[PDB]
Amino acid sequence: GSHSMRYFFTSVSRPGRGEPRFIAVGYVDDTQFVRFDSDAASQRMEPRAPWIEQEGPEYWDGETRKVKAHSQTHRVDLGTLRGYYNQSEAGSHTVQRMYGCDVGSDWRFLRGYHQYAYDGKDYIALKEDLRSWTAADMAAQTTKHKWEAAHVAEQLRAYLEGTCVEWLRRYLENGKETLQRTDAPKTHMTHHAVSDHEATLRCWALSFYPAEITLTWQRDGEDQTQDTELVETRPAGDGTFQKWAAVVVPSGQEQRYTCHVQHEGLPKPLTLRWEP
């Protein structure tokens, strides 16, 4: 199937004392595999998946040097941005950056992205062409002119189309056992009386991977959105995900309702009904 490698970086300034709090995390699909936390003891990029631990010391030294360079760029950025927005030296502010690459079923480059945010709002983003920039406001327009002059998009396009995709293929091979395994949702239905004549039916999808899934209710074969509740997909904490969808029904009419589950791990979508 399709795959992605994504890195997420957050820095939060601490005006009272010291340098910004910095957290970097790397993912292959929905699996976290590396992390860096400026508050952690190691001061190194750390493994978070068994398949990355086999990488040699030149790998770890290189990733540590680059992630510490990212933290310093963010520290400088927080200063520049405070100036662009005429903000006080007293408030805490945040910079977020995410970049990465997607590959198709053939494991060839599909798309790349690089987005930057200041105080939780879009600041500057590389366009899908990997050549152009989307600047949200006039401060970002100043950055865009500097990035054009400094060949930033060319350096990113070379990384996203080359290095990013090459290492993603390497990780998918080394971590085959889990990364290329799809875990279809384990599904069941629960019934919760809300009175002596109505009940909630809850359709559960557990222990699935990747996180992408669709749970939909139907009544007599037509989609039902009235009296439904769908929770956001959530992590189980063991690398898999969970979700549920519920509908309130008149008691005795449960057989009209069907829950439909779509997931990459299912060749054909599942249909569940309440078993009285």
């Binding site: 790998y59 290189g62 400088v76 950025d77 350096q155």
Partner: peptide
């Protein structure tokens, strides 16, 4: 692997 790139905001 993370990017090795340079930029100034």
């Amino acid at each position: 692997t993370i990017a090795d790139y340079n930029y100034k905001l």
